[PDB]
Structure 1
Amino acid sequence: KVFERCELARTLKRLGMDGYRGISLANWMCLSKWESGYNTRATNYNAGDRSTDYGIFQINSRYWCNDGKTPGAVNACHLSCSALLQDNIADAVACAKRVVRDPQGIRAWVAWRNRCQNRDVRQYVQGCGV
C-alpha cells in the first residue's frame, strides 16, 4: 500500500507514534517519506552486505527482522521480514518502536539524519488533524 500523507499521519498517531520516546509525528512522517515514499512494500537489497531493507520504514534484515537469507543476521523485532511488507503497518510500527528504544533513537536511520535532522518538518503534518 502507498499511503497518502495525512492518512499515514493519523494512522501513525492511532498506533501511538506521536511523541514515542520523544519523537514527534512530523519526524516519523519525514522518515517514512524519505525511506519509502509511504510505500509498505518498498524493498532495497544491499549487495555489499547481503541484507535487505523492508517496508514503509525500510527496516534492515541484519538486525531487526528475519528473512532467513542474511549472513549472521539477528531478529531484534522477533518478526518475519514479511510482516514488514503488509498493508497494515501495526507490526512495522512495533518494530520501528523497538529500533528507537536503542541508544541512537531516531538517528538509527541515516536517511533521517540526511533529510530530517535539523530541518523544518512541520510541512509533513500540516492539515492532517493530528
Structure 2
Amino acid sequence: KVFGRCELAAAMKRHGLDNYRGYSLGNWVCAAKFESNFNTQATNRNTDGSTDYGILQINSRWWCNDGRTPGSRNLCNIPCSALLSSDITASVNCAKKIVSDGNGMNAWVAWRNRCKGTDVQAWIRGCRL
C-alpha cells in the first residue's frame, strides 16, 4: 500500500507513535517518507546481506527473520514479510522496540540525514488529526 502523507500520520497517531519516546509525529512521518516513500512494500538489500523491509525499512540483521540473514537476532520476533503489510501495526510495534534501544531515531539513517534538525512539523501540516 502506498500511503498518503496525512493518512499515514493519522494511522501512526492512532498506533501510539506521536511523542513516543519524545519524538513528535512529524519525525515518524518524515522518516517513512525518506525510508520507503510511504510504500509498505519497499525492500532494499544491503551489502552485509541483510535486507530492510517496509515503511520504516526495518533491518533483517537484528529485528526480523527473513531466512536468509545468517546471524540474524529476530528481536521483534516476527517474519520480515509481516513488515510489508497494508496494516502498519507490526512495523510500528517493532519500531517502538528499536527507538527504545539506545540511539533513538538515529537508528534510521534517512531520519538522521534528512529529518533530524529540520522543521518536521511540516510533515503533518494540514492534516486532520
Provide the C-alpha distance between the structure 1 equivalents of 2:75 and 2:124, rounded to a whole number of angstroms: 30
Which digits, 9 at most, give the CA deviation of each residue in 1:38-69, with x for residues without a partner? 000000011x2110000000000000000010
Provide the C-alpha distance between the structure 2 equivalents of 1:92 and 1:121, rounded to a whole number of angstroms: 21
RMSD: 0.7
Q: How many residues align?
A: 129
Give the C-alpha shift of residue 20 in structure 1: 0.5
Provide the C-alpha distance between the structure 1 equivalents of 2:70 and 2:79, rounded to a whole number of angstroms: 15
Provide the C-alpha distance between the structure 2 equivalents of 1:34 and 1:7, rounded to a whole number of angstroms: 16
Give the C-alpha shift of residue 129 in structure 1: 2.2
**Gapped runs of 5+ residues in structure 2?**
none
Matching residue of 1:4: 4
Give the alignment of 1:13-52 within 5 angstroms: 13-46=13-46, 48-52=47-51
Matching residue of 2:64: 65
Amino acid at match of 2:124: V
**Gapped runs of 5+ residues in structure 1?**
none
Identity %: 60
Provide the C-alpha distance between the structure 2 equivalents of 1:129 and 1:20, rounded to a whole number of angstroms: 20
Matching residue of 1:79: 78
Which digits, 9 at most, give the CA deviation of each residue in 1:7-60, with x for residues without a partner? 0000000001001011110000000000001000000011x2110000000000
Amino acid at match of 1:4: G
SS in structure 2 of the partner of residue 44 of structure 1: strand
Q: TM-score, normalised by structure 1?
A: 0.97
Which digits, 9 at most, give the CA deviation of each residue in 1:82-112, with x for residues without a partner? 1101000001100010100100111111111
Q: TM-score, normalised by structure 2?
A: 0.98
Matching residue of 2:90: 91
SS in structure 2 of the partner of residue 100 of structure 1: helix
